[PDB]
């Protein structure tokens, strides 16, 4: 790794994702291969999130990727602005299809026709379905791995309820899991908030979000989304049930939808990565500890490495013994640091017979000598501390880089020196357009649930910044 | 359920998959919704296979679904008949794309250009990658849920090796896992074999396969596929390395690919399904035991529900997947039939009389037998009944395949045996021209299923084909 983050972030990012073996490029613009190292992080997030929404009663399923042409039109599910992003299939082989067929950019138009046929009474509610799947958005915006890709993997949850109280409660439960994914799995702090009228999903009532800060850019990014849809889609698609008390009266279902993507992995990369490459938070590292031998008799050195064995596996630590004879120790050192392995355990002959080893933390660079039989306890303590270290530096960097302005003067003074700032806000769109072009430019990120301090007149303190 | 499996198979199948809540229909022909009841089975297969290939050193990844026109134009990875099955993206919104992009029907052309860049020396091998992903094949044959769908879910594994002996061993380990998915998870027996030259993947060296039999059809089906590709694809795609100890000879990697799909769930439905609905093998049933509570007081009623919720915890604690149906708006008789249609292996009936007699009742979905159990043996005995349901389901389907797969040595007995809804092992040339002949002669058709590794009888000392001498016993039959 030779590019440096603070000077050229784009090229640093591209060289970390490649030299960590996370991403391989493809010959289609905005499409990336997720190699096992990148995919294992996604799998870990999936394991966590899946387990959580299962306690909420959500069930997994799989809906078609193709949407019929007339099911896309149906109503103002999308105002035509979102239409350029939709890829259309028009032939199989050379045979032009009777009607063109669309590639899921989201699955409302595929799912809700089915909800309307499953809901024949209030006993059929709630419906709570989730799917892990790929989606295609023909993004015009300049493409980057995991940040802005043309195909990505995600989960989209879609739930329908008899009452507003239930739907409204889920929206905030899901948003909290998203925050837990980022803050507890990925050691990235986030700001919960609600979208302004400009930035909310046109198809919903309100849109909640979690926002993250990437210092080296000075830019924020939407990490996850949870919408209350009210009855916007229920009336559109006729998901209706009989009023239990009033004969002949249909009442429309209340709906939510929520989504999280592999953009998580890029954000973790942009947040924790350093000038030596990736840095993996322990709770998602598929290798938390790598064993590397340093320095015939030698077979005793490999038996000692392989005695860390289960001694680490038996304490349920993900461990890799890199015993390959074909690479130098120094090669292994740099190879696993580029991949972001939280702890390097080096065994040298000196230490086999002094019944010691050395551990090197990927965040601090600290090298530490441990008694041979203190491996289990102290290694666990280091991996827990690395996690807390990584979340603490990212917390204290968001504290530093998120401040207040009450004037356009100091908001602008502060925006352009790499800052995101909460400002009092009209709340109206054309004002938001106006702030967008003056500072060029800043978007609205979210109206925080717990803003700075207590507050056309200002309706809300709203967090502003340049954003992906 | 209204249709009967024996009389009209399609409508019975259509009504089992829907009224069990496995499938919802879509407005695109050959595309189907996988509702939780069916998707949970896929997740169970996924969990097993994933563990197994992890021991073989295979790692999971995700490659793009889009294939460039120009990457598809470089190599010849497929014969010309497969080109129609490819769906093309030709515009975004209203803007026609400069070059069209194809939807993955399989991922050789997407992956192997990357393999070529990752492989620069012998220490870069082996490469062992797997992906769970969706695939589109614009099928001409008649589409049926989970049997033959235009979009499906699958796993495709692609591995690259330095030596031929490594590749050759993976092919059959993988195949044996497929047969394990079928025989141990779904209680379906299968026939391992090699495809004839006609039916093998044209661009590889040889194709191994497992075939399953659907009695009610008299039809067999390809349940899984494992290819040895030799070096046909390493030469096309230039996956080469130099060995320092073999100076001056270019080493092309030895490759395999293998695939298994949600056709699994369709086969399970056809094999074990009955005229009361789905029949779930305990090992993939996402609910193995359903607890149903079956006037006097409201405090008493809460105690009945507390006992059901105490059976649920005792059963989770012995790792039995359990759902307590505590919905108050349905009768017990209703819940009884609803969970039978869904194929739940065991119904647990708890009533007030059994609560104070410290008993419960279990009824098996495979035989229907009702059993009163002491409250204390719930964990031990319920576990035993699920293990016996599994063994029963696999035993009956085995005893149905032995019955329905026989040997014939004349085209004349081959025809009569075929026409009684059976699959036939016949002595066979192996040549393509002949295979077309059997196909239409038996229509006035039967195709080859596989060449069994362990055929019923040993062939030859110069035994002649059913035409040219016989090379091998070949398993022939009508097929999905
Ligand atoms: N092209 C993309 N690649 C990866 N992740 C994405 C992409 N577009 C959106 N996401 C993520 O998926 C989630 C789904 O939200 P959605 O796409 O509806 O919001 P959006 O307002 O279009 O977002 P954005 O400004 O990121 O395009 C978002 O929270 C975001 O983090
Ligand atoms: N349209 C489909 N829907 C579901 N599963 C399929 C479909 N086509 C193939 N499969 C399954 O995918 C596996 C691997 O795919 P492969 O290309 O080897 O099949 P195939 O030879 O084309 O199959 P088939 O003879 O059924 O057309 C097969 O073992 C089969 O079980
Ligand atoms: O995905 C969501 C909201 C929510 N869905 C459920 C998961 C969470 C997500 O936030 C809207 N959306 C975002 N980016 C889009 C691009 C195109 C279209 C589009 C274009 C034409 C027709 C059509 F039906 C949809 C929708 C898009
Ligand atoms: O899928 C396999 C082999 C194996 N892959 C690895 C997983 C297991 C599978 O058996 C060949 N094949 C079968 N059905 C096809 C339809 C179209 C094309 C095709 C591909 C590219 C371009 C094109 F025009 C057509 C290949 C197909
Ligand atoms: Mg977008
Ligand atoms: Mg936006
Ligand atoms: Mg085929
Ligand atoms: Mg075939
Ligand atoms: Zn204003
Ligand atoms: Zn012959």
| Residue in the structure block whose two tokens are 């049930």 | A241
CA triple B270-B275-B276, angle to 5 deg: 110
Question: Do A131 and A215 sit in the same domain of this protein?
Answer: yes
| Residue in the structure block whose two tokens are 């390395």 | B241
- Residue A439, Cβ neighbours under 10 Å: how many? 17
Of B60, B153, B327, the CB nearest to A62: B153
Structure tokens at B261: 């799909």
Nearest alpha carbon, ligand 1 atom 23:
A222
Query: Do the annotations mark residue A144 as ligand-binding?
Result: no
**Rounded Cα gap, residues A137 and A153, in angstroms:** 11
Name the experiment that determined this structure.
Answer: X-ray
For residue B461, give Cα distances in angstroms to B76, B411, B470, B471: 40, 20, 10, 11
Determine the straight-line distance between the first and last CA of chain A, rounded to whole angstroms.
25
For residue A357, report the phi and psi dihedrals to the nearest 5 degrees: -150, 175
Q: Which ligand is nearest to the CA of A150?
A: 1
What resolution does the deposited structure have, in angstroms?
2.3
Q: Is A380 helix (H, G, I), strand (E, B) or coil?
A: helix
Question: Do A322 and A417 sit in the same domain of this protein?
Answer: no
For residue B437, report the phi and psi dihedrals to the nearest 5 degrees: -65, -45
- Which chain B residues are within 8 Å of A60, Cβ to Cβ? 36, 39-40, 43
**Chain B residue with Cα closest to A118:** B24
| Residue in the structure block whose two tokens are 């391992």 | B192
* Residues whose CB is less than 8 angstroms from the CB of residue B328 and which lie 6 or more positions away in sequence, other chains included: none
| Residue in the structure block whose two tokens are 């072009």 | A437
- Domain CATH number, residue A45: 3.30.930.10
Structure tokens at B316: 């989770």
CA of residue B147 to ligand 7 center, whole Å: 11
Per the structure, the count of domains in chain A is: 3
Of B33, B95, B113, the CB nearest to A84: B95
**Rounded Cα gap, residues B448 and B9, in angstroms:** 23
Domain span at residue A132 reads: 9-272
Residue A126: is the preceding peptide bond cis (ω within 30°)?
Answer: yes
Question: Do A422 and A371 sit in the same domain of this protein?
Answer: no
Q: Is B154 in the pocket of ligand 4 (CB under 6 A)?
A: no
**Rounded Cα gap, residues A357 and A370, in angstroms:** 6
**Rounded Cα gap, residues B146 and A40, in angstroms:** 29
| Residue in the structure block whose two tokens are 């009777």 | A98
Final residue before a domain boundary, out of B400, B422, B445: B400
CB-defined site of ligand 3, < 6 Å: A 72, 77-78, 82-83, 85-86, 105-106, 108-109, 137, 156, 201, 225, 257-259
From A78, A134, A159, give the residue whose CB has the most ligand 3 atoms within 8 Å, as the site to mutate: A78
Are B262 and B106 spatial neighbours (Cβ–Cβ below 8 Å)?
no
Question: Do A266 and A287 sit in the same domain of this protein?
Answer: no
Residue B37 covered by a domain: yes
**Rounded Cα gap, residues A41 and A269, in angstroms:** 11
Nearest alpha carbon, ligand 2 atom 19:
B225
DSSP class per residue in A226-268: EEEEETHHHHHHT-EEE-SSSTT-EEEPEEEEEEEETHHHHHH
Q: For B230, left (φ over 0), alpha (ψ -120 to 50), or beta? A: left
DSSP class per residue in B234-262: HHHHT-EEE-TTSTT-EEEPEEEEEEEET
Beta strand B219-230 with B206-214 is antiparallel
For residue B398, report the phi and psi dihedrals to the nearest 5 degrees: -65, -50
Residue A72 covered by a domain: yes
**Rounded Cα gap, residues B58 and B63, in angstroms:** 15
- Residue A290, Cβ neighbours under 10 Å: how many? 25
From B181, B261, B449, give the residue whose CB has the most ligand 2 atoms within 8 Å, as the site to mutate: B261
Question: Do A253 and A394 sit in the same domain of this protein?
Answer: no
Q: Which residues on adjacent β-strands are paired with residue A32?
A: A25
Q: How far is B165 from chain A (nearest CA, A)?
A: 21
* Residues whose CB is less than 8 angstroms from the CB of residue B276 and which lie 6 or more positions away in sequence, other chains included: B1, B340, B341
Query: Do the annotations mark residue A149 as ligand-binding?
Result: yes
* Residues whose CB is less than 8 angstroms from the CB of residue B246 and which lie 6 or more positions away in sequence, other chains included: none
Of B35, B93, B134, the CB nearest to A65: B134
Are B243 and B122 spatial neighbours (Cβ–Cβ below 8 Å)?
yes
**Rounded Cα gap, residues A386 and A383, in angstroms:** 5
Beta strand A219-230 with A87-92 is unpaired
For residue A73, give Cα distances in angstroms to A79, A160, A201, A231: 10, 22, 17, 18
Cα–Cα nearest to B181, from B274, B47, B286: B47
**Residue count of chain A:** 468
Question: Do B394 and B422 sit in the same domain of this protein?
Answer: no
Question: Do B107 and B85 sit in the same domain of this protein?
Answer: yes
**Rounded Cα gap, residues A22 and A15, in angstroms:** 10
For residue A193, give Cα distances in angstroms to A174, A200, A445, A464, B407: 13, 11, 8, 12, 71
- Domain CATH number, residue A461: 3.30.110.30
| Residue in the structure block whose two tokens are 């505590």 | B326
Final residue before a domain boundary, out of B230, B249, B272: B272
Query: Do the annotations mark residue A467 as ligand-binding?
Result: no
Maximum Cα interatomic distance, chain B, rounded to a whole number of Å: 91
Are A270 and A223 spatial neighbours (Cβ–Cβ below 8 Å)?
no
From B105, B195, B257, give the residue whose CB has the most ligand 4 atoms within 8 Å, as the site to mutate: B105
Cα–Cα nearest to A86, from A103, A71, A101, A64: A103
Q: Is B61 helix (H, G, I), strand (E, B) or coil?
A: coil
Cα–Cα nearest to B251, from B116, B158, B159, B57: B116
**Rounded Cα gap, residues B184 and B190, in angstroms:** 11
Question: Do A339 and A357 sit in the same domain of this protein?
Answer: yes
Residue A4 covered by a domain: no
Question: Do A337 and A215 sit in the same domain of this protein?
Answer: no
**Rounded Cα gap, residues B66 and B84, in angstroms:** 17
Q: How many CA atoms lie within 13 A of B131 on its CB side?
A: 23
| Structure letter (DSSP) for residue B183 | I
Cα–Cα nearest to A336, from A392, A405, A375, A288: A288
Q: What is the 3-state secondary structure (H, E, C) of A190-206?
A: CEEEECCCCCCCCCCCE
What atom in ligand 2 is closest to the CA of residue B207?
18
Residue A2 covered by a domain: no
Are A237 and A231 spatial neighbours (Cβ–Cβ below 8 Å)?
no
**Rounded Cα gap, residues B193 and B223, in angstroms:** 12
Final residue before a domain boundary, out of A375, A398, A421: A398
* Residues whose CB is less than 8 angstroms from the CB of residue A413 and which lie 6 or more positions away in sequence, other chains included: A405
Are A151 and A139 spatial neighbours (Cβ–Cβ below 8 Å)?
no
DSSP class per residue in A7-68: T-HHHHHHHHHHHTTSEEE-SSTT-EEE-HHHHHHHHHHHHHHHHHHHHTT-EE-B--SEEE
Q: How far is A158 from chain B (nearest CA, A)?
A: 13
Burial tier of B76 (Cβ tally within 10 Å: 0-12, 13-18, 19+) = exposed
Question: Do B26 and B124 sit in the same domain of this protein?
Answer: yes
Cα–Cα nearest to B414, from B401, B403, B399, B428: B428
Are B455 and B194 spatial neighbours (Cβ–Cβ below 8 Å)?
no
Residue B3 covered by a domain: no
Query: Do the annotations mark residue A454 as ligand-binding?
Result: no
* Residues whose CB is less than 8 angstroms from the CB of residue B462 and which lie 6 or more positions away in sequence, other chains included: B469
- Which chain B residues are within 8 Å of A125, Cβ to Cβ? none
Q: Which ligand is nearest to the CA of B480?
A: 2
Q: How far is B54 from chain A (nearest CA, A)?
A: 12
Q: Which residues on adjacent β-strands are paired with residue B277?
A: B274
- Which chain B residues are within 8 Å of A87, Cβ to Cβ? 89, 91-92, 101
For residue A94, give Cα distances in angstroms to B85, B107, B259: 10, 20, 27
Q: How many CA atoms lie within 13 A of A290 on its CB side?
A: 26
Are A165 and B166 spatial neighbours (Cβ–Cβ below 8 Å)?
no
Question: Do A122 and A27 sit in the same domain of this protein?
Answer: yes
- Domain CATH number, residue B304: 3.40.50.800
Q: How far is B223 from chain A (nearest CA, A)?
A: 21
Could you tell me where the beta strands, DSSP code E, fall in B112-234? Answer: 127-136, 151-161, 191-194, 206-214, 219-230
Are A129 and A59 spatial neighbours (Cβ–Cβ below 8 Å)?
yes
Cα four-point dihedral sign B283, B286, B291, B292 = negative
Cα–Cα nearest to B293, from B223, B250, B252, B347: B347
Residue B4 covered by a domain: no
* Residues whose CB is less than 8 angstroms from the CB of residue A166 and which lie 6 or more positions away in sequence, other chains included: A126, A254
Structure tokens at A23: 């991403």
Query: Do the annotations mark residue B299 as ligand-binding?
Result: no
Q: Could A34 and B91 be called an inter-chain contact, meaning their C-beta atoms sit closer than 8 Å? A: no
- Residue A27, Cβ neighbours under 10 Å: how many? 14
Across B241-273, b (16+ Cβ under 10 Å) vs e yields beeeeeeeeebbbbbbbbbbbbbbbbbbbbbbb
Q: Provide the angle, in degrees to the nearest 10, between the axes of the packed helices B432-441 and B411-418.
A: 50
**Rounded Cα gap, residues A218 and A461, in angstroms:** 20
**Rounded Cα gap, residues A391 and A183, in angstroms:** 7
**Rounded Cα gap, residues A174 and B8, in angstroms:** 46
**Rounded Cα gap, residues B345 and B390, in angstroms:** 9
Question: Do B437 and B314 sit in the same domain of this protein?
Answer: no
* Residues whose CB is less than 8 angstroms from the CB of residue A111 and which lie 6 or more positions away in sequence, other chains included: A63, A129, A158
User: Which run of H or of E encompasses A359?
Assistant: strand A356-361
For residue A245, give Cα distances in angstroms to A162, A242, A251, A273, B41: 14, 9, 11, 59, 39
Q: Which residues on adjacent β-strands are paired with residue A160?
A: A127, A255
């Amino acid at each position: 790794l030779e590019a440096k983050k603070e000077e050229n972030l784009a090229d640093w990012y591209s060289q970390v994702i490649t030299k960590s073996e996370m991403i391989e490029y493809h010959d289609i613009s905005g499409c990336y291969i997720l190699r096992p190292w990148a995919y294992a992080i996604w799998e870990a997030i999936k394991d966590f999130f899946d387990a959580e929404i299962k306690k909420l009663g959500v069930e997994n399923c799989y809906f078609p990727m193709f949407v019929s042409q007339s099911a896309l039109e149906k109503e103002k599910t999308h105002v035509a602005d979102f239409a350029p992003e939709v890829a259309w299939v028009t032939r199989s082989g050379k045979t032009e299809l009777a009607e063109p067929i669309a590639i899921r950019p989201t699955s409302e138009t595929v799912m809700y026709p089915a909800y309307a046929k499953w809901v024949q009474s209030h006993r059929d509610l709630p419906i709570k379905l989730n799917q892990w799947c790929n989606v295609v958005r023909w993004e015009f915006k300049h493409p980057q791995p995991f940040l802005r890709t043309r195909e990505f993997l995600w989960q989209e949850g879609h739930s329908a309820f008899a009452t507003m109280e239930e739907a409204a409660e889920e929206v905030l439960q899901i948003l909290d899991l998203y925050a837990q994914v980022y803050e507890e799995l990925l050691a990235i702090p986030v700001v919960k908030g609600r979208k302004t009228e400009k930035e909310k999903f046109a198809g919903g009532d309100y849109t909640t979000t979690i926002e993250a800060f990437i210092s080296a850019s000075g830019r924020a990014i939407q990490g996850g989304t949870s919408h209350h849809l009210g009855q916007n889609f229920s009336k559109m698609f006729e998901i209706v049930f009989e009023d239990p008390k009033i004969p002949g009266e249909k009442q429309f279902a209340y709906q939510n939808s929520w989504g999280l993507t592999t953009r998580t992995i890029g954000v973790m990369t942009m947040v924790h990565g350093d000038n030596m490459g990736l840095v993996l938070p322990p709770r998602v590292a598929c290798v938390q500890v790598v064993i590397i031998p340093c320095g015939e008799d030698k077979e005793a050195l490999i038996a000692k490495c392989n005695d860390y064995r289960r001694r680490l596996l038996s304490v349920n630590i993900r461990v890799r013994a890199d015993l390959r004879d074909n690479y130098s120790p120094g090669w292994k050192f740099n190879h696993w640091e580029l991949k972001g392995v939280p702890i390097r355990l080096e065994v040298g002959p000196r230490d086999m017979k002094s019944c010691q080893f050395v551990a090197v933390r990927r965040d601090t660079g600290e090298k530490l000598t441990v008694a041979e039989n203190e491996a289990e306890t102290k290694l666990q303590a280091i991996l827990e501390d690395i996690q807390v270290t990584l979340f603490t530096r990212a917390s204290e960097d968001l504290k530093t880089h998120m401040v207040v302005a009450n004037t356009m003067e100091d908001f602008q003074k502060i925006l352009d020196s790499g800052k995101i700032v909460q400002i009092p806000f009209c709340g109206e769109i054309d004002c938001e357009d106006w702030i967008k072009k003056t500072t060029a430019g800043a978007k609205s990120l979210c109206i925080p649930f717990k803003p700075l301090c207590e507050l056309n007149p200002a309706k809300y303190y709203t967090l502003f910044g340049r954003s992906y």
